Amino acid sequence: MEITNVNEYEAIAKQKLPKMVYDFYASGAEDQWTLAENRNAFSRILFRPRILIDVTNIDMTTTILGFKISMPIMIAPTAMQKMAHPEGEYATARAASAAGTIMTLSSWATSSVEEVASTGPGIRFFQLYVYKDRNVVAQLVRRAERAGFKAIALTVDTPRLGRREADIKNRFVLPPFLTLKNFEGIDLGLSSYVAGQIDRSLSWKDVAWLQTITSLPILVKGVITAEDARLAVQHGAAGIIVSNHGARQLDYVPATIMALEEVVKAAQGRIPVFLDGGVRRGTDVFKALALGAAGVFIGRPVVFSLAAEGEAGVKKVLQMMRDEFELTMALSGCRSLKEISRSHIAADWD
Amino acid sequence: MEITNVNEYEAIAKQKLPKMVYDFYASGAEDQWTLAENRNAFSRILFRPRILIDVTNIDMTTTILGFKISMPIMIAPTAMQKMAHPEGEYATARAASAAGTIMTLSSWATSSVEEVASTGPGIRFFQLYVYKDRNVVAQLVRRAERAGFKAIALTVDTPRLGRREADIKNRFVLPPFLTLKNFEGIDLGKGLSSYVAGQIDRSLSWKDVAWLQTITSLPILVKGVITAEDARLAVQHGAAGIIVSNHGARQLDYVPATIMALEEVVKAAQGRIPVFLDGGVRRGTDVFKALALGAAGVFIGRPVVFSLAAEGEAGVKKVLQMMRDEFELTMALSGCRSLKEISRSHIAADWD
Ligand SMILES: Cc1cc2nc3c(=O)[nH]c(=O)nc-3n(C[C@H](O)[C@H](O)[C@H](O)COP(=O)(O)O)c2cc1C
């Protein structure tokens, strides 16, 4: 018994919630292509432990944009799960302290910006989108603040949505007793309005154009090819993370991996590098974490455990990686990310 | 050698600011009749001491909306006060914070809600300013999220805004460099200074008042009342706290003085919710009165700006200790040990 295997939640799930509905969380838009390698490329790349490492003091817990987090296994902009909950989403809140790190969510993530965090003194990372005008966007500046909802990040990839006809192929709408609780009281109603943001304003013309607008940081997400990404660096925001909707948006997109050093090279340091690929067993997250990482990005993973174990639920998960990967860390020795290296990780591709 | 008069400032900080600045802060609607009827108004309420009592200790200490604002005087949301010392809004939050009260800022702010809050730990409110299309509002309202602006001073008296002469002769040049970083620049999607002078909804109603509620909690106040027809109306429509006002006598003139118009506004909504009048108030002598009429706590405007503009974070920091250190004479000499023992039982007022 007990919770050991990460995808132990995967069976249970089948018989824990509605399909139509869950079809919003984990679901790969397009050809099931990118969710495969996402659980298979680091499952591909190996590591050869460094030998006889004396240990006393270890850095699992680390200084990032200030703070020394135990496990920076930060999330990623989430979405639509109140029909996957009783007492709330202050779970992933009370978690970013228990299983402390970067809490990141979305506006579809139907929680009240102030309410979820009703458990603690930490910072926060908002889900953006270049919403179909600026009465829709721009105003994100007007929310996710320093002394509050800390850092920003403009989604430099999406201006339409990945069509995975799971829920799409049936009768879905949404829980009556809900809306997009974040966007709610708007220039609405809160039925269709919010979707009408889909427009291809794919330019930096409205990116650095915004830095003179916000005082808040901007980990502009979605940067899977330094080949316009050098430009996502030549022009841009901050901590620029490669991200393919979490193994989708266009299932056939390569896993967020390959762009790892291909962008950490066409950007390096500067305004940071990251990757959004699925990393369930507390090793997988480690892989990319060496070859091109700073925190430990997620979102939906906690979505089984966000869906079936409450506040705690998600907390343990990050531990499923903080315990897990620290095992790794101290196992093959290394006690900080600087001593962490490439030729120790037995990567197939170099 | 040190000089004390809580407005001896007005005139010094008058010579410190460019015409436009002083007049932007020192105006009133057209004839400005109610400007002096904002001060010579409290003079029509005669005191009424009680004597031979224990005054070793007193008590300014409050709790407005479940908030102990250190002392009963608060700050009212003045527009760009960064023009009047490039810091303003920013150093007012820190000033009040050290002063333990509220630092209330408007949407017409120089420093944004992102920007000011870096000042750190302390109680503060933010004035809502509903606009034509409510997508930008909706997001501003939820900006002061679990950052903490506690309430929202929704300003019900500013659809078409008051005709303060001055401005439109010495045509108010919104200082090229300097910006209203609270929106700073929005647009739908196809500007600053006149974006803000490019947005608002002249049809704000108790139906919009409805909507605002499903987009938040943050105790929605009623800013801009001087009658009891919109007072009982104010409890009729779910809320707490009122911000009875004239708008620094900036929206409409010849409309009663906050103090004078007060009795009917408090007396109307009884025990439902507490009222706070932000206007006229420049001494604890006269501050006392408001609290006597039934307005549990009061905000402050102009007096707070002719201080930053005058002398930095020390400016307002006397505007508050001079103010606070003036309610400990008033409460003392009238026989009171704290707010509990005040009330208009304890006085006399001209009209009556
Ligand atoms: C420069 C200036 C701009 C103002 N703009 C606003 C505003 O944006 N909205 C609002 O409700 N109050 C505004 N106020 C008025 C106050 O919030 C407050 O009612 C007033 O200044 C208190 O009057 P007193 O100055 O005699 O204390 C303005 C006042 C001044 C001095």
Side-chain angles (χ1 to χ4, degrees):
Chain A
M1 283 67 186
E2 157 245 3
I3 227 64
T4 48
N5 183 36
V6 189
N7 308 252
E8 221 178 345
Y9 296 67
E10 271 204 53
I12 310 149
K14 290 309 169 149
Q15 297 140 91
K16 222 258 179 70
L17 41 155
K19 165 218 283 221
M20 195 191 278
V21 154
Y22 186 77
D23 305 333
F24 174 54
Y25 316 87
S27 295
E30 314 280 38
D31 311 47
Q32 230 295 66
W33 205 93
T34 326
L35 264 311
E37 65 198 299
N38 264 115
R39 280 200 225 172
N40 265 35
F42 5 39
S43 333
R44 182 204 307 272
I45 267 66
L46 3 154
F47 64 88
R48 210 170 288 229
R50 207 291 177 151
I51 328 180
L52 277 182
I53 296 288
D54 170 15
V55 142
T56 301
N57 240 243
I58 26 275
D59 181 296
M60 46 287 232
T61 334
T62 202
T63 282
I64 48 276
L65 246 209
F67 22 68
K68 270 97 292 90
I69 48 176
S70 327
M71 97 299 306
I73 320 180
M74 64 274 249
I75 0 288
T78 68
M80 299 147 46
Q81 27 100 189
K82 279 210 56 168
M83 73 310 246
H85 246 309
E87 82 319 299
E89 194 230 8
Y90 306 32
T92 51
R94 171 92 115 92
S97 313
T101 186
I102 293 188
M103 219 285 82
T104 46
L105 326 74
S106 77
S107 320
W108 281 237
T110 54
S111 312
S112 203
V113 282
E114 43 170 88
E115 284 316 91
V116 156
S118 296
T119 182
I123 51 84
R124 251 144 238 127
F125 272 81
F126 207 145
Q127 160 250 258
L128 279 82
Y129 265 164
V130 92
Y131 300 127
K132 231 176 69 43
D133 275 330
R134 301 295 142 164
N135 268 15
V136 269
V137 216
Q139 275 285 304
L140 275 69
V141 157
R142 303 85 217 221
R143 270 209 204 149
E145 342 283 87
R146 207 145 301 237
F149 202 163
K150 212 268 281 292
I152 300 181
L154 184 279
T155 295
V156 304
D157 48 88
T158 28
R160 128 187 297 155
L161 309 186
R163 26 154 314 312
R164 50 96 175 66
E165 343 104 319
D167 40 355
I168 297 193
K169 95 196 165 190
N170 286 326
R171 175 65 269 132
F172 212 45
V173 170
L174 164 105
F177 33 54
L178 255 199
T179 42
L180 254 13
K181 253 72 145 48
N182 212 286
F183 259 120
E184 30 176 17
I186 39 171
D187 203 25
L188 44 81
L190 347 76
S191 3
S192 45
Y193 181 100
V194 292
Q197 261 66 91
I198 57 178
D199 227 286
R200 294 51 39 159
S201 189
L202 285 353
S203 64
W204 351 78
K205 288 60 187 287
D206 311 290
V207 100
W209 143 113
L210 203 171
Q211 290 242 31
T212 21
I213 288 198
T214 193
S215 63
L216 326 160
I218 328 176
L219 91 78
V220 252
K221 291 179 51 175
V223 79
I224 83 150
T225 1
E227 295 67 35
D228 190 60
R230 49 173 59 89
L231 312 172
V233 176
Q234 172 157 299
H235 330 233
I240 321 176
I241 176 193
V242 179
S243 172
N244 46 345
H245 235 110
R248 81 221 165 113
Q249 189 29 52
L250 180 50
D251 245 76
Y252 234 91
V253 274
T256 346
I257 159 56
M258 39 306 255
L260 176 94
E261 317 180 84
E262 161 203 73
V263 299
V264 98
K265 283 211 64 184
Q268 30 81 242
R270 183 106 286 271
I271 35 182
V273 160
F274 295 124
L275 159 171
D276 221 321
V279 273
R280 21 270 46 280
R281 275 304 229 196
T283 303
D284 316 298
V285 281
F286 201 92
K287 225 64 53 165
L289 95 38
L291 302 318
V296 229
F297 259 72
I298 54 162
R300 159 202 306 177
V302 282
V303 151
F304 301 70
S305 332
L306 194 171
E309 306 183 323
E311 310 201 285
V314 307
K315 85 107 74 191
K316 321 137 159 174
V317 177
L318 276 75
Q319 256 327 126
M320 184 155 41
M321 238 68 48
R322 191 276 216 201
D323 163 272
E324 237 296 54
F325 91 151
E326 206 297 87
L327 276 162
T328 297
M329 285 171 29
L331 206 143
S332 305
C334 286
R335 326 78 75 129
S336 82
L337 241 81
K338 128 218 302 296
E339 51 190 284
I340 307 318
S341 59
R342 23 107 68 162
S343 266
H344 168 199
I345 306 295
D348 300 35
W349 149 290
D350 272 16
Chain B
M1 280 297 287
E2 138 120 14
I3 39 166
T4 292
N5 210 308
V6 197
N7 236 19
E8 198 206 88
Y9 275 82
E10 195 177 287
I12 36 192
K14 157 152 187 175
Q15 35 142 296
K16 287 173 178 283
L17 340 133
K19 190 59 193 148
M20 192 199 60
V21 198
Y22 187 74
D23 297 2
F24 180 65
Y25 303 141
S27 51
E30 306 152 271
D31 286 285
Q32 316 163 87
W33 180 71
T34 10
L35 259 67
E37 192 62 21
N38 236 267
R39 319 299 296 103
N40 316 307
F42 306 80
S43 297
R44 281 222 191 74
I45 315 295
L46 276 191
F47 277 118
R48 221 230 216 169
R50 279 281 327 198
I51 41 100
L52 277 193
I53 323 142
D54 279 45
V55 199
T56 315
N57 286 212
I58 314 184
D59 221 73
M60 288 164 282
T61 283
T62 344
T63 299
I64 254 42
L65 285 76
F67 278 89
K68 172 252 276 282
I69 53 173
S70 68
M71 109 282 252
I73 304 90
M74 288 160 262
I75 309 188
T78 77
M80 285 137 312
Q81 50 158 264
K82 197 165 212 284
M83 304 190 311
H85 175 6
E87 204 118 315
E89 229 95 21
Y90 246 102
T92 46
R94 196 216 326 279
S97 289
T101 317
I102 308 269
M103 176 299 215
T104 315
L105 51 152
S106 161
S107 299
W108 284 182
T110 19
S111 321
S112 177
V113 250
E114 45 177 14
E115 310 172 40
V116 191
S118 68
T119 65
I123 346 167
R124 56 216 73 152
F125 298 168
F126 185 65
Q127 183 242 1
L128 194 170
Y129 245 154
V130 139
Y131 297 143
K132 297 190 64 288
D133 307 283
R134 322 307 210 281
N135 13 45
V136 297
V137 162
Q139 315 199 214
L140 192 92
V141 153
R142 297 171 291 196
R143 181 172 212 185
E145 52 179 88
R146 205 201 156 226
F149 278 69
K150 312 320 199 89
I152 348 181
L154 175 58
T155 302
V156 295
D157 64 302
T158 324
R160 220 170 280 216
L161 19 65
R163 190 193 303 101
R164 40 285 212 130
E165 229 72 290
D167 298 51
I168 28 77
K169 283 171 183 171
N170 309 305
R171 305 164 176 308
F172 182 168
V173 189
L174 298 273
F177 238 5
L178 191 278
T179 77
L180 327 98
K181 302 154 263 295
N182 192 294
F183 291 90
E184 161 253 325
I186 292 189
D187 279 64
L188 223 79
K190 163 203 81 282
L192 31 56
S193 303
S194 295
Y195 145 100
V196 287
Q199 250 294 58
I200 229 174
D201 215 58
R202 278 167 177 174
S203 280
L204 219 202
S205 23
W206 301 102
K207 78 142 178 297
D208 267 308
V209 99
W211 146 63
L212 291 157
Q213 294 192 51
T214 60
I215 107 175
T216 190
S217 185
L218 302 172
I220 285 278
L221 307 303
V222 192
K223 180 169 189 158
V225 198
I226 37 162
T227 178
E229 283 79 299
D230 286 272
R232 68 198 76 178
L233 228 315
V235 173
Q236 281 185 32
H237 301 229
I242 221 169
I243 313 180
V244 219
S245 172
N246 23 65
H247 214 79
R250 292 252 270 168
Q251 281 297 91
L252 208 67
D253 248 40
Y254 326 103
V255 311
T258 335
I259 165 234
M260 225 49 149
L262 194 65
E263 202 67 341
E264 108 213 44
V265 191
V266 157
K267 244 297 67 187
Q270 317 138 49
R272 306 94 142 111
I273 71 97
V275 302
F276 329 97
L277 59 332
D278 57 335
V281 282
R282 293 186 243 292
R283 292 208 89 134
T285 31
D286 73 69
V287 154
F288 172 93
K289 304 156 179 161
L291 264 107
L293 314 166
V298 40
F299 306 62
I300 61 178
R302 289 171 181 90
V304 93
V305 278
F306 290 130
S307 316
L308 76 164
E311 50 237 73
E313 288 186 48
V316 317
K317 268 193 168 310
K318 250 216 300 187
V319 144
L320 312 164
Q321 234 244 343
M322 296 192 289
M323 198 93 56
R324 166 182 252 129
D325 290 17
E326 273 203 34
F327 207 18
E328 266 195 321
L329 182 49
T330 320
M331 271 194 300
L333 270 52
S334 320
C336 297
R337 191 185 285 184
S338 38
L339 2 89
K340 183 272 130 207
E341 313 154 39
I342 303 191
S343 183
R344 243 185 49 90
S345 298
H346 209 119
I347 210 174
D350 171 275
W351 65 69
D352 60 39

